[PDB]
Each structure stands twice: as structure tokens, then as C-alpha cells.
Design a protein around this ligand. Structure first.
Ligand SMILES: [Mg+2]
Ligand SMILES: [Mg+2]
Ligand SMILES: [Mg+2]
Ligand SMILES: [Mg+2]
Ligand SMILES: [Mg+2]
Ligand SMILES: [Mg+2]
Ligand SMILES: [Mg+2]
Ligand SMILES: [Mg+2]
Ligand SMILES: [Mg+2]
Ligand SMILES: [Mg+2]
Ligand SMILES: [Mg+2]
Ligand SMILES: [Mg+2]
Ligand SMILES: [Mg+2]
Ligand SMILES: [Mg+2]
Ligand SMILES: [Mg+2]
Ligand SMILES: [Mg+2]
Ligand SMILES: [Mg+2]
Ligand SMILES: [Mg+2]
Ligand SMILES: [Mg+2]
Ligand SMILES: [Mg+2]
Ligand SMILES: [Mg+2]
Ligand SMILES: [Mg+2]
Ligand SMILES: [Mg+2]
Ligand SMILES: [Mg+2]
Ligand SMILES: [Mg+2]
Ligand SMILES: [Mg+2]
Ligand SMILES: [Mg+2]
Ligand SMILES: [Mg+2]
Ligand SMILES: [Mg+2]
Ligand SMILES: [Mg+2]
Ligand SMILES: [Mg+2]
Ligand SMILES: [Mg+2]
Ligand SMILES: [Mg+2]
Ligand SMILES: [Mg+2]
Ligand SMILES: [Mg+2]
Ligand SMILES: [Mg+2]
Ligand SMILES: [Mg+2]
Ligand SMILES: [Mg+2]
Ligand SMILES: [Mg+2]
Ligand SMILES: [Mg+2]
Ligand SMILES: [Mg+2]
Ligand SMILES: [Mg+2]
Ligand SMILES: [Mg+2]
Ligand SMILES: [Mg+2]
Ligand SMILES: [Mg+2]
Ligand SMILES: [Mg+2]
Ligand SMILES: [Mg+2]
Ligand SMILES: [Mg+2]
Ligand SMILES: [Mg+2]
Ligand SMILES: [Mg+2]
Ligand SMILES: [Mg+2]
Ligand SMILES: [Mg+2]
Ligand SMILES: [Mg+2]
Ligand SMILES: [Mg+2]
Ligand SMILES: [Mg+2]
Ligand SMILES: [Mg+2]
Ligand SMILES: [Mg+2]
Ligand SMILES: [Mg+2]
Ligand SMILES: [Mg+2]
Ligand SMILES: [Mg+2]
Ligand SMILES: [Mg+2]
Ligand SMILES: [Mg+2]
Ligand SMILES: [Mg+2]
Ligand SMILES: [Mg+2]
Ligand SMILES: [Mg+2]
Ligand SMILES: [Mg+2]
Lengths: 109, 135, 72
RNA sequence: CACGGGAAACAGCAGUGAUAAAAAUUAAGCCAUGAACGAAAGUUUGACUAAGUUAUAUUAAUUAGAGUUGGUAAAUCUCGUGCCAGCCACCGCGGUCAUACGAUUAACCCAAAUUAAUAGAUCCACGGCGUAAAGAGUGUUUAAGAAAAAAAAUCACAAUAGAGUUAAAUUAUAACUAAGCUGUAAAAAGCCCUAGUUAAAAUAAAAUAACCCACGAAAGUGACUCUAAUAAUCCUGACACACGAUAGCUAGGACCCAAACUGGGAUUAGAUACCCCACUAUGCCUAGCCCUAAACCCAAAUAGUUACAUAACAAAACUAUUCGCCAGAGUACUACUCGCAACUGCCUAAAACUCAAAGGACUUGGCGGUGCUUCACAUCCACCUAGAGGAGCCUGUUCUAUAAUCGAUAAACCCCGAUAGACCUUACCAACCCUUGCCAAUUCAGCCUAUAUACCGCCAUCUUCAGCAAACCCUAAAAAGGAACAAUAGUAAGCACAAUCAUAGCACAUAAAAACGUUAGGUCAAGGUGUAGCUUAUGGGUUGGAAAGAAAUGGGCUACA
């Protein structure tokens, strides 16, 4: 642009970070509504164990359970965190393994 | 080995420099000869851009006052009777005779074109050259 | 080459025009509604003015014309 | 705000409920500083001082654990799993030989910490706008700026608005004459109140000139005549002002001809299309709206330069003054707003969400119901001869059928592996038997078990196709390309082709030959083998069985004289 036009707009300003699933908090605590399964997207396939949780912010959201195997029923409270799962379209949250009612993965016995 | 970049410098430049760097361990003949009596312009590569815009070349067109005369001659009498010999270094044409006569009568001070021209035609008829003219 | 871009828009526009044809009288209704709303908010804006100026009624001979509801 | 009113106050230190991902003592002193008060000694002070608690951070040593090992990015081995279970910041990993999952071995890297999640720090354009995001359809002025050195305003041609006019067609309409006319790749439907000739108003549209390049701000303007007429002593400038192709709207008038729509006719599986015929809105005039175009010469206005200088392609590269624009792709010429004679509208123009690309130019292939040349020699058409497809048989497929093999299975399978199955062959089925069970030895023999998508061996196929390929050399960069013989960047060994050899003399023909690759083409059942499987059996023997024709079909034989 010209010097006038650059004077008239001011310098460019970095837009504030748009906020995600955890609303800018590191974790959230939430209760399990339902446990189900979702297929990944096309190029690569499995069936991934997810749950639906209600979060302390009152918002209800699909969330994913890492590790192989798990015990989760309705009414269990879990703690969820921000990592997005690449296969699953739409699923932006992850259960923290090892807290409240989600226990660490049990080594094969 | 050597340097095959044609565009970077002169052969002189590249050669001297490659010796300087201790790459090329033997001095080539033409080098000493070159240093001794170098060419007028450094033979460095250059790209021939096409001119643009208002720019033109500097070349002067070659004209002499005699031409200003010769034109009247050719308009009047066409090319002369004697043809032309472009082999003979000293050859003078009929046009050139007419020129010299015209120049001599210019030195008598006649500033009129008609007088000069016609009287030079007469001065030529005197010597025995035929001007057949043209319509 | 570039037409791929054009083609996309082409499709979009077509599909939308089609939709306006189907959805037409629904659209009519919604726009008429918005016009009424507009007229009203306007009247309120005026009323608000003559009241905050302490007057009770609108000034003498004030009819507050209907601008948006103007017959098509 | 606090007169009033809700109502009964830790946002003093500690504590506590609730709430949150978030967790310090219901502690000791006024001894020091500060503060208050005292004339003062001094008193008071949860300020504060000294302590308590906590890996939050540093440091010091007494302390070893975490993460990672496909690439980015330091570092891996053996098992298990088999597109499952799971993994990833991004690219991606997992389909039976996983350094990417899970565990082990080794390693790497941080270290009283280490990873993950979230917020920051940092990060966009003094860059760009022909083709990628972007020069806003046009001009004038306002505001605001630039003036930074030298000059200028001005003449063939189709600007614009009026009014007048008409050559070539075409048509109403008669007059003769003919039965047809129209229409297509070919027809049909239509019309015969049709067609040809001769006469002709209105309406509309403006051959040739134009191989010209003018006028207008742009949109636009090229039959003829006349009237009026093409701002600025010439910088840039809006959202203000005035215009703005086609289509479209309102009202009145026109209507030759064209024609969305619609109705007929073909076409087709269908044909709400392309092709044929009719006919309407509309194209025209007057008046008013509407304000959009691939309004694109995709290249802003005004002055300049041809210096420096090739991303690619294109219309060569740039300076100065300005203004308008542009911050991934979709979503989106959209949703909401404001304004507008617009009411299925124009203008202005987001977000959630989704993705890890989306784009631009090129390169070599391949392909093309693309064009131009040249061909086909049993070969496409034209053409010649004998056959197949119909019959009976013969023999093979497919099905169906059986307790009862396998393999081939477009070209490139189908009298094929087989130049060969009554037992044998033999791999199959059913009963039975035998377990260091062919051998010099062997916790070993043996396996026609699985995988031809692990392979060697043999081949098929493009193919009687002419190319493949090492070593170099060249190119304002190279993905790749590399010829011009009156020669312009190519040399090249090698393998193919070619030549020779064979068919007992030449010649010709035929045979043979035919690279690199293509089809994960064919074959683990020629044999051999990788990987994985069986071992008193998926191994070795004996005896007997393997039928069959609802149907479909290939190739042959013999015929129909
Ligand atoms: Mg996959
Ligand atoms: Mg993750
Ligand atoms: Mg715990
Ligand atoms: Mg779309
Ligand atoms: Mg208060
Ligand atoms: Mg407190
Ligand atoms: Mg208080
Ligand atoms: Mg509490
Ligand atoms: Mg804390
Ligand atoms: Mg606690
Ligand atoms: Mg004190
Ligand atoms: Mg004291
Ligand atoms: Mg105390
Ligand atoms: Mg992991
Ligand atoms: Mg494995
Ligand atoms: Mg990794
Ligand atoms: Mg692992
Ligand atoms: Mg620490
Ligand atoms: Mg663009
Ligand atoms: Mg423009
Ligand atoms: Mg536009
Ligand atoms: Mg009429
Ligand atoms: Mg008919
Ligand atoms: Mg004309
Ligand atoms: Mg002017
Ligand atoms: Mg101006
Ligand atoms: Mg218009
Ligand atoms: Mg119109
Ligand atoms: Mg009308
Ligand atoms: Mg009409
Ligand atoms: Mg028509
Ligand atoms: Mg029809
Ligand atoms: Mg008029
Ligand atoms: Mg145009
Ligand atoms: Mg544009
Ligand atoms: Mg401008
Ligand atoms: Mg940029
Ligand atoms: Mg967007
Ligand atoms: Mg539009
Ligand atoms: Mg819109
Ligand atoms: Mg809005
Ligand atoms: Mg044949
Ligand atoms: Mg026969
Ligand atoms: Mg036959
Ligand atoms: Mg037969
Ligand atoms: Mg068979
Ligand atoms: Mg087999
Ligand atoms: Mg088979
Ligand atoms: Mg085949
Ligand atoms: Mg047998
Ligand atoms: Mg037997
Ligand atoms: Mg066997
Ligand atoms: Mg194979
Ligand atoms: Mg060759
Ligand atoms: Mg190049
Ligand atoms: Mg090459
Ligand atoms: Mg060679
Ligand atoms: Mg011979
Ligand atoms: Mg021969
Ligand atoms: Mg052969
Ligand atoms: Mg040969
Ligand atoms: Mg295969
Ligand atoms: Mg096979
Ligand atoms: Mg075998
Ligand atoms: Mg048969
Ligand atoms: Mg055969």
C-alpha cells in the first residue's frame, strides 16, 4: 500500500486466539452420558471407543478414550483434555487416563 | 580442471583467478602473451537486449555537401554516360566532374542555383561530355 | 483450469435460485414481517425522542409516515 | 450514589461451605522496621519480623525416574497382532516378514524431575493486485494530497439528441400459370387460403466500402440529409453527482422477420435436449423504471525511463506521485443488517463448522466419437474362395449332479497341462490298515498342504514393434530436452532389428530369430525352492468306487447329394 494508506489503517494487529473445546482451560471435569463407537474417516479404518460427556460448563460433547480396553459406564465422572483425534471427524476431546473413574490401562494378565 | 562458465568473466579473468586459487597448476601460453599485449576491450559476456521506448541508436548518417549537389545532378541527367567502375580506386564519374565544376564556380561567388548549375553543365560540355538529360 | 472455480459458483448459484423459487412465499412472509418490525422500531425511536425531551404527546400534527411498509 | 430500600455483609489474618482443572497455619512474637497515641519511660499493631505448609521456580548436594527411537528429529532388536487391537504435533502407521500398535532387548534424551493439556511470549504487508487473494462498469467534483526540472489547450473518418428521408431484401394483396410446396444425415409432421413469375404500402434491419481503425468517459457508435454538439491553460480524488450492454418491469403504440415458452414431428432405453414445423412473451417506438455482465484489452490514473534485469505462461522490464483493493480453502455472488420506484431483486457481506490443503504455470506420458497428410496387403471398406452359426455324431467347457481331484478359463481359455484316465496312471471318495515310516548318518524321514501377490525354471502377449542402455557432452536450469545434410549440439560401446546360418547350389520364400519392458498374465501338481503350515497324520499302503444329463456352449468329423 502507500504510506498514507498504511497510516490510515494503522499497523497490522495479531488477531486474538479463537477458543476451543475446553474453553481455554487445561482440563474439564465431566460425567459420562453414553459409551459408544465411531468409525474413522475413509483412508484408514477401525472402530474407535468414544463416550459422550457432559462438562462442568454445561456443554455436552463427544470425547475419546485412549488405550486398549476400558471400563466406563454412565454416571462415571472423568476428566477430559484437549488433544484432537485425527481419524475421528468432530471429536476434539480426550479422556485423561488415570483420574477419577477412568483407571490406568491394566497390563495384560 | 578449468572453468566452463562463459558468462561469469573473461577467459583472462577466470584463468588468472583459477591460477590464483592454486587450482590450475600450469600457466597456459596464451596467458603471458595476453598480459603482454591485451585487447582493447575485456571479452566479458554481455546479453543483447532489444531497445525499447524512445531509445534509438547513436549511429550518424553519412552526408556531404557534394551530395546536396549530386542529387540535383541525378534528378536532371540520371546516372551519367560513363557508367561506373567500382574497381578503379581513383575513378571519377561524370557526376563527380559536375561536382568539381560546380564547386569551382561557387568560388567565383555566384549564389544563384540556376547560374551555378547551368554554367557547370556548359563547363562540362566544353570538355566533351554529353548530358542527354531526362524529361 | 480456472473453470473449476467458475463451475463451483455456477452450481451454487443455480441451486440457490432453484431454492428461492421453492421457498418463495415463505420468504415473502419473512420479509414482510421484518418490514413491519422495522417500521415499529422506527416509531419507538421517534416516541423515545419526543418523550426524553419531556413532551407528553408527539408534537402538533405529527403523523409519523410509514416508510418501510411503502406499497411495493 | 446511599438520604432511603433490600436486608444483616472476612475482597483484613486464619479458617469453612458451595463452586472450579486449580487446595499454605483456625500458628509465635512486637525483638527489628513502619504506623497510632503519649512530655516521657512506653503501650498497641494478623502491617510486619522470624517460623509452619507446598517440587511452583532457582541454586546446592545426600537423590533415579520419566519421555522417546518411521521422517521432520538424537536413538531398536526379538516376539505377538493381522485395516483387528490400537498409534500420530504434521506427514502418516496397522491387509501375515510392523524399526510406527502391544511387550521384550538394546539405545537416545532430559533428570528430582519428565511428559501431556491449556494459555502466553514470538509470529502477517515498507508485501503484493495479466494468469494465483486483489485495479473496484464509467466520468466529474468534495475532503485530502501531489505540485518537486522542461513544454502543451485544437482539426479526413462510425460520439450524442432531435427532425426529415430510403436503396437491397421481405410481406398484406390481387393477376396469370403449375399441382404440389416446405423440410432434413434421412424422414415425419405442417401447408396446399400453397408454389413460380409480374405488380406492391407498412414494419424492421442497415450488402459492398472496412485488407480502414475513427468518434465517445464508459456502456457504445459504421444507410442518407440538415440542426444542436463532443468539460478543464488539462495532476490524483469518493460512499457525493450524473451515466451505464443484454435481459427484465409498468403504460400506450407497432409486428415484416426472429424467437425463450408451449403444442405438434422425428430421434432415443428415456429425450421434459440437440434436428423439423407452428406460434407467444420479447427484440421495435414513446414515457418511466431496473443498475446487472467473462461491464475482461482479466493489465488503475498522471508523468516518465530502456538503465539493472529472464520463476513459468502471457502482452518485455521498471521508476515517481496517488487512490482502490488483497491476510489458506471451502461454507459464500450465502445468513443477518442499512439503503434503494428494486417485494423470486440489487447493493453491503459474516460465523459456526469442515479440511491440510485449495490454487497458478509447466513437464513427460497416455488418451481424444479433434484436424491434416500417408497408409492397411489376408486386410479395415470395396471385393474373391472355402467354412462356422441349423442336423447327427466326436471331443472340451459351463452349469446343474455326485461320497468322489486339481490346473487353464477376454485378446493371451475351451482335442488346453494330456505326443493321451478300464486296474495302474491318480493327486479324488469310501472303507480298512502302518507309525524313525525308500536313504550312509541325522529329536528325523515324509507332505500333489497354503501362498504363482515371495520365487528360479519354462512360456504367453504387445511383436517381424523398433527400440533399450551404460559412459560422456550441451541447456541465462535441466521435471526434462538434445534433429535440421546447402546441417542449427550432440558423440556413444553394448543388446535388439539388420546381416549370416537352416531348408544340402543361387535367388525368393519359409523356418528360426525378435532386446528393454507391459499384463502382480500362466504354472508351488515338471522339478526346485522363500515364508507359513501338518507329524500314531494335511504322511505311507491295500481293496473297491468316481456315477449322470434339465439345460447352455466352443472346436471338430460326417453329411445334406
Ligand atoms: Mg489405513
Ligand atoms: Mg493426541
Ligand atoms: Mg491417582
Ligand atoms: Mg457448492
Ligand atoms: Mg456502594
Ligand atoms: Mg480470608
Ligand atoms: Mg472489613
Ligand atoms: Mg472447601
Ligand atoms: Mg496452585
Ligand atoms: Mg488436600
Ligand atoms: Mg514494633
Ligand atoms: Mg516500639
Ligand atoms: Mg498476635
Ligand atoms: Mg505411543
Ligand atoms: Mg511380525
Ligand atoms: Mg514416531
Ligand atoms: Mg511401540
Ligand atoms: Mg521442577
Ligand atoms: Mg484473480
Ligand atoms: Mg478497468
Ligand atoms: Mg462487478
Ligand atoms: Mg400489416
Ligand atoms: Mg405428409
Ligand atoms: Mg447498408
Ligand atoms: Mg476535451
Ligand atoms: Mg480528476
Ligand atoms: Mg440498462
Ligand atoms: Mg426493453
Ligand atoms: Mg407492451
Ligand atoms: Mg410477437
Ligand atoms: Mg421460426
Ligand atoms: Mg416435444
Ligand atoms: Mg426519440
Ligand atoms: Mg464489452
Ligand atoms: Mg475486474
Ligand atoms: Mg483511479
Ligand atoms: Mg502474503
Ligand atoms: Mg473463511
Ligand atoms: Mg450476481
Ligand atoms: Mg444476496
Ligand atoms: Mg449482520
Ligand atoms: Mg480375414
Ligand atoms: Mg464341412
Ligand atoms: Mg454350417
Ligand atoms: Mg453344428
Ligand atoms: Mg474342469
Ligand atoms: Mg494348487
Ligand atoms: Mg480355477
Ligand atoms: Mg488372460
Ligand atoms: Mg482310477
Ligand atoms: Mg486305486
Ligand atoms: Mg496326499
Ligand atoms: Mg505371475
Ligand atoms: Mg536402432
Ligand atoms: Mg527452460
Ligand atoms: Mg537424454
Ligand atoms: Mg549406443
Ligand atoms: Mg542359404
Ligand atoms: Mg530372406
Ligand atoms: Mg516364429
Ligand atoms: Mg534376424
Ligand atoms: Mg494373477
Ligand atoms: Mg490362476
Ligand atoms: Mg511342492
Ligand atoms: Mg457340445
Ligand atoms: Mg483347439
Amino acid at each position: 500500500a502507500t504510506l498514507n494508506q498504511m497510516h490510515r489503517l494503522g499497523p497490522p494487529k495479531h488477531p486474538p486466539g479463537k477458543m476451543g473445546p475446553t474453553a481455554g482451560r487445561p482440563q474439564l471435569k465431566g460425567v459420562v452420558l453414553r459409551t459408544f463407537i465411531r468409525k474413522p474417516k475413509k483412508p484408514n479404518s477401525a472402530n474407535r471407543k468414544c463416550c459422550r460427556v457432559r462438562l462442568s460448563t454445561g456443554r455436552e460433547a463427544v470425547c475419546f478414550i485412549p488405550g486398549e480396553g476400558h471400563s466406563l459406564q454412565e454416571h462415571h465422572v472423568v476428566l477430559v483434555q484437549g488433544g484432537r483425534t485425527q481419524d475421528l471427524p468432530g471429536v476434539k476431546l480426550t479422556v485423561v487416563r488415570g483420574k477419577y473413574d477412568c483407571g490406568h490401562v491394566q497390563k495384560k494378565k | 580442471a578449468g572453468s566452463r562458465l562463459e558468462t561469469v568473466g573473461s577467459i583472462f579473468s577466470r584463468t588468472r583467478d583459477l591460477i590464483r586459487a592454486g587450482v590450475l597448476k600450469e600457466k597456459p601460453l596464451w596467458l603471458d602473451i595476453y598480459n603482454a599485449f591485451p585487447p582493447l576491450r575485456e571479452p566479458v559476456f554481455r546479453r543483447p537486449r532489444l531497445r525499447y521506448g524512445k531509445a534509438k541508436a547513436a549511429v550518424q548518417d553519412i552526408f556531404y555537401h557534394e551530395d546536396r549537389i549530386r542529387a540535383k545532378f541525378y534528378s536532371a541527367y540520371g546516372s551519367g554516360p560513363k557508367a561506373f567502375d567500382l574497381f578503379n580506386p581513383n575513378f571519377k564519374s561524370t557526376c563527380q566532374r559536375f561536382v568539381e565544376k560546380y564547386i569551382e564556380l561557387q568560388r567565383l561567388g555566384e549564389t544563384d542555383e540556376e547560374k551555378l548549375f547551368v554554367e557547370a553543365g556548359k563547363a562540362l560540355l566544353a570538355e566533351g561530355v554529353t548530358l542527354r538529360r531526362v524529361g | 483450469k480456472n473453470i473449476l472455480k467458475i463451475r463451483r459458483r455456477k452450481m451454487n448459484h443455480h441451486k440457490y435460485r432453484k431454492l428461492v423459487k421453492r421457498t418463495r412465499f415463505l420468504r415473502r412472509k419473512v420479509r414482510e414481517g421484518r418490514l413491519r418490525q422495522k417500521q415499529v422500531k422506527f416509531e419507538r425511536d421517534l416516541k423515545r425522542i419526543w418523550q426524553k425531551a419531556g413532551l407528553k404527546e408527539a408534537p402538533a400534527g405529527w403523523q409519523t409516515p410509514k416508510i418501510y411498509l411503502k406499497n411495493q
